[PDB]
Design a protein around this ligand. Structure first.
Ligand SMILES: Nc1ccc(F)cn1
Length: 330
């Protein structure tokens, strides 16, 4: 079997991507944030605190003839940005563009933090990292990918995020028309539960490539590219007027600048992120100071190849016996 769904940026800056997911019987379509950095499938629901719901579409388990309460199961999750959610668990039918999973754990939110409330376009998340990070207690649950894997034509899923454009999440196959050249595969460590790999280096604009090992995770759930301080300092040094701002919370640059590109290594292969992908618009409405898309990972504890980097490439999350990552230019 295979699945294919269109993923769409939530706004003009590509702050996040939403993909419609069908839940329950009859189908309840919720727009979820597919996150290769987490492992909980959670949704806004009929159980979410009224004041915490502001425009999102909710899942009503009582109206699904296939929804079953998972006795005594609860979940609670905290994310890198300080956001969080928690609640109870149902098992229900979940389909992503023609690919169906019966008995998939759907975590119904009883509480969501202010950032989820404020984001009316995101109805919940669909975790695509390794099931070892799933928060369901006392019995840990599996991800949508983990449950569908045995059935897929190939044990893979692909991310093809667009820059100010629609894109695709494919399950079970590799669309050879969606990329140029070849897919270069690289080793994955699942010890932290993430799609963790090692980049062979970087280049800033037309500058010389620095061969250096950068350990990080392929994370579609993180908007920006988070790299070591030395690397990020080398990038922003090429932009006139760029500076690290403690009040804003990162590197800022004059909105009138034309940003240099950023290249990262995948083995001998190179993925080029055009400069425009690194522009995250005014720091505050009407300001001429803009927020950078490449930020330091010094406060995080891990380098993050988020949407900024991934949207420059066709990405294969290969769930074979020994999992690996594939990257191609497109
Ligand atoms: N890095 C993040 C932050 C929030 C979220 F829901 C997922 N990933």
């Amino acid at each position: 079997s295979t699945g294919s769904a269109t993923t769409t940026p939530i706004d003009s800056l590509d702050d996040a991507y939403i993909t419609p997911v069908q839940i329950g019987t009859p189908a309840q379509t919720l727009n979820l944030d597919f996150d290769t950095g987490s492992s909980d499938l959670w949704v806004f629901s009929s159980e979410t605190t009224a004041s915490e719901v502001d425009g999102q579409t909710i899942y009503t388990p009582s109206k699904s003839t296939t929804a079953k309460l998972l006795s005594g199961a609860t979940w609670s999750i905290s994310y890198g940005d300080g956001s969080s959610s928690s609640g109870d668990v149902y098992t229900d039918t979940v389909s992503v563009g023609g690919l169906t999973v019966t008995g998939q754990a759907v975590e119904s939110a009883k509480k969501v933090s202010s950032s989820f409330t404020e984001d009316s376009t995101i109805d919940g998340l669909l975790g695509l990292a390794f099931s070892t990070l799933n928060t369901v207690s006392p019995t840990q649950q599996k991800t949508f990918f983990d449950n569908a894997k045995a059935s897929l034509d190939s044990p893979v899923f692909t991310a093809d995020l667009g820059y100010h454009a629609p894109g695709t999440y494919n399950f079970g196959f590799i669309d050879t028309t969606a990329y140029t050249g070849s897919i270069t595969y690289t080793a994955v460590s699942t010890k932290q539960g993430f799609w963790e790999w090692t980049s062979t280096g970087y280049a800033v604009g037309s500058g010389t490539f620095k061969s250096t090992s950068i350990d990080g995770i392929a994370d579609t759930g993180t908007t920006l590219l988070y790299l070591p301080a030395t690397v990020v300092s080398a990038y922003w040094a090429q932009v006139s007027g760029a500076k690290s701002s403690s009040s804003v919370g990162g590197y800022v640059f004059p909105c009138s600048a034309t940003l240099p590109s950023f290249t990262f290594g995948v083995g001998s292969a190179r993925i080029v992120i055009p400069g425009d992908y690194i522009d995250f618009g005014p720091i505050s409405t009407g300001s001429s100071s803009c927020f950078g898309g490449i930020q330091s990972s010094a406060g995080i504890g891990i380098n993050i190849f988020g949407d900024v980097a991934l949207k420059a490439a066709f990405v294969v999350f290969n769930g074979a016996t020994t999992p690996t990552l594939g990257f191609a230019s497109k």
